Design a protein around this ligand. Structure first.
Ligand SMILES: *[C@@H]1O[C@H](CO)[C@@H](O[C@@H]2O[C@H](CO)[C@@H](O[C@@H]3O[C@H](CO)[C@@H](O)[C@H](O)[C@@H]3O)[C@H](O)[C@H]2NC(C)=O)[C@H](O)[C@H]1NC(C)=O
Ligand SMILES: *[C@@H]1O[C@H](CO)[C@@H](O[C@@H]2O[C@H](CO)[C@@H](O[C@@H]3O[C@H](CO)[C@@H](O)[C@H](O)[C@@H]3O)[C@H](O)[C@H]2NC(C)=O)[C@H](O)[C@H]1NC(C)=O
Ligand SMILES: *[C@@H]1O[C@H](CO)[C@@H](O[C@@H]2O[C@H](CO)[C@@H](O[C@@H]3O[C@H](CO)[C@@H](O)[C@H](O)[C@@H]3O)[C@H](O)[C@H]2NC(C)=O)[C@H](O)[C@H]1NC(C)=O
Ligand SMILES: *[C@@H]1O[C@H](CO)[C@@H](O[C@@H]2O[C@H](CO)[C@@H](O[C@@H]3O[C@H](CO)[C@@H](O)[C@H](O)[C@@H]3O)[C@H](O)[C@H]2NC(C)=O)[C@H](O)[C@H]1NC(C)=O
Ligand SMILES: *[C@@H]1O[C@H](CO)[C@@H](O[C@@H]2O[C@H](CO)[C@@H](O)[C@H](O)[C@H]2NC(C)=O)[C@H](O)[C@H]1NC(C)=O
Ligand SMILES: *[C@@H]1O[C@H](CO)[C@@H](O[C@@H]2O[C@H](CO)[C@@H](O)[C@H](O)[C@H]2NC(C)=O)[C@H](O)[C@H]1NC(C)=O
Ligand SMILES: *[C@@H]1O[C@H](CO)[C@@H](O)[C@H](O)[C@H]1NC(C)=O
Ligand SMILES: *[C@@H]1O[C@H](CO)[C@@H](O)[C@H](O)[C@H]1NC(C)=O
Ligand SMILES: *[C@@H]1O[C@H](CO)[C@@H](O)[C@H](O)[C@H]1NC(C)=O
Ligand SMILES: *[C@@H]1O[C@H](CO)[C@@H](O)[C@H](O)[C@H]1NC(C)=O
Ligand SMILES: *[C@@H]1O[C@H](CO)[C@@H](O)[C@H](O)[C@H]1NC(C)=O
Ligand SMILES: *[C@@H]1O[C@H](CO)[C@@H](O)[C@H](O)[C@H]1NC(C)=O
Lengths: 140, 601, 140, 601
């Protein structure tokens, strides 16, 4: 498997690889790099979906240095008149977008956090891609 | 067989298979062939001849430079084309020649430049035309649109449309019967000269994120006058740049139009008072807000004529105080900010839904909390904490009531559902209830569905609480940590068909309580630990019983209670998945299905 | 056992008798009589306790025409600086008081409601008296 | 033996036994004789001679008209008299003659008229004197009070005291060392002439419900000037008539006094703003409100010097916003009105208690919610709904934490107690928690007591969550509906002494998990259904085990697993109440104690 690097901060080393048989390319950037201490920034994405990005959502499987957390379900855009403009896209339509984010207020232990991301969308609710992220964390 | 085969001889999809021509080995009679992400640099005359019968075609990202005249010729019954992402620099006039019944045409991300040099002018029965994300500078409808009827959707979003002129839409005046849902989103526009829209009729109109300031928006709304749109949608997107300002002077002049349904989707400015805004959006029959942060607003009370109101995903500071004389339906779901509830005054209200807000009640339910007297539907599920201090007084016409996953309190201190004599559906599941009063279900003489899963009982004993519920057909008592039943508990329940008793802690299987249930069809005893019985009295079940789930619970396959296993193998016409019932206690006999074992002794 | 009548209203017939061996007299009045539909009035009490009315409370055992409710515990006055003046009284000290009450908002079924009242007080937490009330209810 | 006998030869109580004289059959050496509600119309000289040694005497409602001189003569060691309810119309001078050590004298409801013709003038070592509910018109202390030292309480409530004069308390000036807790409640007073209290020192003073208007109260408070009371209590009673009015002008002039602790108990007027009231009650070191309805108050923020604040049983509209620079302890318990919580700013706070209010949190716990950084104690039990969105950040010095019977949320989504490295006590019991993350108890390296009863586990399996809790001595896992243990779960718990595992659903008793717990002393397996074991491997328990409760659970006394019952009868030096362990499954062998049965086979 090939390793795709993203960014380094003072206390993080985000990276990712592909989950399943499908290996459709994707371009992800974050500016500035995420500090696992409370951060704020922009997330730029360039993609060409293989299904309609309609009622897209994410399944998140997180692991904290070999302890599993429960499965998370994040609904990105819902039904009709959604917050984001990119989720009216169709197959083969280029998506080229930027989303702002911010967070703070939780202490994390040192270790090797890992996250499997499963995107689900479409009318028959099939999967779009699966990525596996790896985050190393050494405070200071 | 390169192409994947979805449905036998009908649906054949094969994407990303590095093709260079239409495949030939596919059946002669197939429909809805998916063929995308395959390099086809050029499409030729009579390309699809192996498929005389066909419904759906799809050519997405199949990088096509030129479609020549006569393609798709030997192809009728084709109701859909998807030409998304194909860079077309020369579309030969006369293409799309033979398509007698074409309804949907998707040409997105094609390098379109205008609509008069577009060969769809002989088409008919064409309903939807999506040309979005193209390069279109002028919103002038060409003449052939008159010939083109049945058109219902026309999406031209994310184009380069800068201005509108009165000469545009000079066509569309000679259309007596015309339903057209238009969409112009993310078009950077700064000039709509007055009188453009006039004697025009649309069925929907969406204008999201195409105004760069407040004065631009004001003048553009002024440019609309006499438009008569049935449903108007304004707003913007979280993904892009937003309005720095939104005050009472904005949205004015929207009173020269004739609107019937309005929606505002996703403001980013912290709106501070609702009236003197939305001022001439009265007499609109349907009002809706989605993702608007009106959290510092004091005077919500005002007399609008709104027959339907919806607030979804908004942030608030306090619960809005509503006083609306004619509002039949209210939907207040998934909101975030403030967590409490206060009295409202809705004299004509029939449908209420406050779900997933997480807000608290105190003295929940009475006709003095909602101000109405004819409320047929009530949903308070997935909220924070509901305190019962009044059985539903003045709400005697209420057929649907849902509480699941809330936190009820004081539910065993009196007869809580004592007034609800016309109630069909009741759901109290995973409310932290501890049934300790016989008479909790008093007065529910019309109930048919009763769900309560996840609610313990006093000392884990099921008392005689299902009396007077003689219409009950569905009863769900699962994950209530039950250990004993009263020998006469399901009496008078002559109409029960499904009885769920799964995942409790039972040891003995008794057939006496169900002796007289003439309509039972499903009996579920699944995740228990049923090892034995009280005696060998286990008689026949009621003749109606057609399914008896007993899987997944612990059995003991030894000399003792061999008669029990004999009596269960005595009836295989009722068990469900005999593969999943096995032994567990004797470590030598483990994982062995119960009905298979022949043991001595 | 002797029956002590209290008052009649349009839909109630309150009465009471004594529970246990102790039969110390007590004078109770309500004006106007309680309507089991939402009422408001005054409760006048004349008594001579046999123990100190210090940190007094009530145990209530209610029965709705042969269905028992859970046991209720009502704390009348608590610790120090209590709301009522009468619960600084001592043994042999006359108590002669009036308390206002009001309620509304619950529908009751016809029947024969019954309530056993156990007063507990003192430093070693012993019982003061026990009364058994009977309420007949026929709406309209 | 008419008189009931409480403690052998020591305490003899006999009330309501229709006596007419002091009984003679009682032992010669008895103490604390209770003798009340018995008719003794007259008391005579040397009445109590059979009791030379005696501590407590009680004559309540023994209707005594005259005590003659010389009674109680042969009676020392008597530290208490209770003459309550006796109508005394002639108390002979010289009564109470011989009582060398008398400390308490209760003369309530006696028909007293004044304090100079009261024969307690030779008494000494007398601490408390209660003369309440009498008929006393004048608050003039007699001269003999100078002779009477050690007096600490003087309760004269419910008397007819109308006015105070400067000549009153001319005595009490020649008392260098004097602690006197005075009490004047329910005395209808309308005149306190100025200068009465001056150079006077009290240790407590209670004035509840003795002012009929606002101006009367104002002038009376003016009559107090230079009083120097250590603790002042004002207010009124719900039982009586109340003040029609309470504004900022009231309670003024209370600034000429020297108060150190203040309490206001039970206002009936809906107070509307706290400052410009309580204005010159600053520099008071302790402030308290009980049963005050300050529900419409906006500006709670102001800089008082209050080192201790208490709000009990009050009604509020919003959570009061506190900004107090020096407030070490806060108690906010049992309040009623408003249900939410907002940020406070208490830079010097060490003790916090918000229990039984029923209020909700959102993002509960961080040093930005309380503004402090040295908080040793925190109690949030019996509240509504607490949402965890921050592990306790900035609260690293916190030794006590209680959550029981609240409703926690999001507790298995990260390490919630990750910062609390100095924590001794943790109580999360009957919070609706579903443990589904190994690592929920990460960071609690100093925990010694852990209580969690009533919290389920994922699929009812106990995982290895008690690692790093190496100081744990008390562990409570009862009514968690557990069915299986991991074979290595209580490892590293070398200091555990009590282990509660009562009222789960177990079937087998395994002794392997507890193989190495060298300090276990109590093991509780009570309300289970333990019938068998996994094998006959059940070895010795750790030698320290001195108690093993196994009562109340179902046993099966048949041929099969007879070895199990043999192994349990193999150890009677550890069982608890062998009377309560019996058989249940074979209907012939029912209710028979397990250790007693001798069965064949
Ligand atoms: C009685 O109530 C219980 C609720 O406890 C119902 O159980 C649910 O039954 C379905 C059907 O077996 C379960 O779904 C299964 O889920 C697994 C895992 O996702 C999947 O692999 C299976 O193929 C199947 O879809 C479900 O987990 C189970 N529990 C819940 C909470 O839904 C039961 O169906 C009810 N019985 C009747 C007769 O209605
Ligand atoms: C044996 O136990 C299983 C569960 O342990 C019983 O499950 C069957 O459960 C499924 C899921 O609840 C039922 O499914 C259908 O589910 C959809 C979900 O949206 C619902 O909308 C449909 O109305 C429908 O209920 C399924 O009906 C149910 N089986 C039957 C026969 O109703 C199972 O019932 C037990 N064995 C037997 C023979 O019932
Ligand atoms: C382990 O935790 C359980 C909690 O479930 C503790 O049980 C409690 O034990 C006491 C002592 O037997 C019970 O009190 C008894 O109450 C009855 C009825 O009031 C009374 O008749 C008895 O004389 C006795 O006082 C109590 O009901 C029971 N349950 C609760 C919820 O408190 C158990 O003590 C703990 N074990 C150890 C070793 O700490
Ligand atoms: C057999 O089971 C019973 C309960 O089923 C165990 O109970 C004993 O429980 C009582 C009540 O919890 C303990 O009581 C004392 O309770 C007061 C209540 O305020 C508490 O403050 C004291 O600190 C003390 O815990 C009692 O200590 C406890 N027994 C023992 C020996 O600690 C019982 O423990 C089980 N059998 C044995 C031999 O432990
Ligand atoms: C980003 O951070 C990662 C992790 O700290 C760096 O990777 C490691 O690089 C150091 C330095 O060469 C090695 O000693 C480690 O063995 C590496 N570990 C792993 C797991 O790769 C990485 O070099 C950083 N990237 C940049 C551009 O500085
Ligand atoms: C108060 O109400 C009770 C109950 O309604 C009355 O008692 C009953 O009196 C009627 C009329 O004489 C009899 O027919 C019933 O048999 C009585 N029943 C019981 C249980 O006593 C009572 O008379 C009323 N009191 C007054 C003063 O009117
Ligand atoms: C995405 O859009 C931005 C907006 O101008 C553009 O600069 C960028 O080049 C686009 N991405 C790609 C891959 O072209
Ligand atoms: C378009 O308008 C006609 C006019 O009645 C209506 O029948 C039709 O349903 C409308 N189209 C849609 C999609 O609703
Ligand atoms: C349901 O209950 C009502 C009221 O008890 C009764 O009239 C009716 O016959 C029952 N059955 C049906 C099918 O409505
Ligand atoms: C109780 O006090 C009131 C107040 O004046 C009085 O009228 C009444 O007589 C008293 N009760 C008795 C039994 O004297
Ligand atoms: C009375 O005051 C003295 C003076 O120091 C004190 O020692 C004593 O404790 C006080 N009395 C009480 C009951 O606290
Ligand atoms: C408790 O834990 C602390 C920190 O791990 C440790 O220093 C101490 O020795 C332990 N035991 C006691 C009795 O403090």
């Amino acid at each position: 498997q090939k390793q795709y690097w993203v960014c380094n901060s003072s206390d993080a080393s985000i990276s990712y690889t592909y989950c399943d048989k499908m290996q459709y390319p994707i371009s992800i950037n974050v500016n500035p790099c995420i500090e696992l201490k409370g951060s704020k920034g922009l997330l730029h994405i360039f993609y060409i979906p293989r299904r309609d990005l309609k009622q897209l959502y994410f399944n998140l499987y997180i692991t904290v240095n070999t302890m599993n957390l429960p499965k998370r379900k994040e609904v990105i855009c819902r039904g009709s008149d959604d917050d984001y403009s990119f989720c009216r896209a169709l197959k083969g339509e280029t998506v080229n977008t930027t989303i702002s984010f911010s967070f703070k207020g939780i202490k994390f232990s040192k270790g090797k956090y890992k996250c499997v991301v499963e995107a689900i969308s479409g009318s028959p609710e099939e999967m779009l891609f699966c990525l596996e992220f790896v985050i190393l964390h050494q405070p200071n | 067989e390169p192409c994947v085969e979805v449905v036998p001889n009908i649906t054949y999809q094969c994407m990303e298979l590095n093709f260079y021509k239409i495949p030939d080995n596919l059946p002669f009679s197939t429909k809805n062939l998916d063929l995308s992400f395959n390099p086809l640099r050029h499409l030729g005359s009579y390309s699809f001849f192996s498929f005389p019968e066909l419904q759906v075609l799809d050519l997405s990202r199949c990088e096509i430079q030129t479609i020549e005249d006569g393609a798709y010729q030997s192809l009728s019954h084709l109701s859909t084309l998807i030409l998304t992402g194909n860079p077309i620099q020369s579309l030969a006039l006369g293409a799309f020649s033979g398509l007698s019944s074409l309804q949907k045409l998707v040409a997105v991300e094609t390098n379109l430049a205008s609509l008069e040099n577009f060969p769809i002018g002989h088409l008919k029965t064409l309903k939807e035309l999506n040309v979005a994300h193209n390069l279109i500078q002028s919103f002038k409808l060409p003449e052939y649109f008159s010939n083109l009827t049945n058109l219902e959707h026309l999406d031209l979003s994310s184009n380069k449309i800068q201005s509108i002129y009165c000469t545009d839409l000079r066509v569309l005046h000679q259309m007596p019967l015309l339903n057209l849902s238009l969409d112009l989103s993310l078009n950077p526009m700064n000039f709509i000269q007055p009188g453009a829209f006039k004697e025009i009729r649309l069925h929907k109109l969406t204008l999201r994120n195409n105004f760069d300031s407040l004065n631009v928006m004001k003048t553009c709304i002024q440019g609309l006058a006499g438009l008569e749109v049935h449903r108007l949608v304004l707003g913007e997107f979280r993904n892009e740049g937003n309005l720095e300002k939104f005050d009472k002077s904005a949205l004015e002049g929207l009173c020269n139009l004739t609107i019937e349904e309005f929606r505002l989707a996703y403001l980013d400015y912290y709106l501070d008072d609702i009236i003197d805004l939305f001022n001439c959006l009265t007499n609109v029959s349907s009002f809706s807000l989605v993702s608007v942060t009106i959290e510092r607003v004091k005077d919500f009370s005002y007399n609008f004529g709104w027959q339907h109101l919806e607030l979804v995903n908004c942030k608030f500071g306090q619960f809005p105080t509503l006083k609306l004389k004619s509002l039949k339906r209210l939907t207040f779901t998934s909101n975030k900010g403030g967590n409490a509830f206060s009295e409202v005054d809705l004299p004509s209200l029939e449908f209420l839904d406050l779900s997933r807000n997480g807000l608290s009640f105190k003295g929940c339910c009475s006709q003095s909390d909602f101000g109405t007297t004819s409320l047929k539907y009530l949903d308070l599920s997935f909220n924070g904490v509901i305190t019962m201090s009044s059985n539903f007084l003045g709400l005697e016409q209420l057929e649907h009531l849902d509480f699941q996953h809330s936190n009820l309190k004081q539910m065993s201190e009196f007869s809580v559902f004592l007034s609800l004599r016309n109630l069909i559906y009741l759901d109290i599941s995973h409310t932290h209830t501890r049934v300790a009063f016989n008479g909790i279900f008093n007065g529910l003489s019309s109930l048919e569905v009763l769900k309560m899963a996840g609610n313990s009982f006093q000392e884990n004993f099921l008392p005689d609480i299902f009396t007077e519920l003689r219409n009950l057909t569905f009863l769900d008592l699962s994950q209530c940590q039950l250990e004993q039943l009263s020998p006469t508990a399901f009496n008078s329940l002559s109409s029960l068909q499904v009885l769920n008793m799964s995942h409790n802690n039972f040891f003995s299987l008794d057939t006496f309580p169900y002796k007289c249930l003439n309509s039972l069809q499903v009996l579920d005893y699944s995740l228990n630990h049923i090892m034995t019985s009280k005696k060998q009295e286990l008689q026949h079940f009621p003749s109606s019983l057609a399914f008896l789930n007993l899987t997944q619970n612990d059995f003991a396959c030894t000399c003792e209670h061999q008669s029990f296993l004999q009596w269960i193998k005595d009836q295989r016409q009722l068990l469900v998945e005999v593969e999943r019932m096995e032994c567990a206690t004797p470590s030598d006999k483990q994982g062995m299905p119960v009905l298979s074992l022949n043991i001595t002794c």
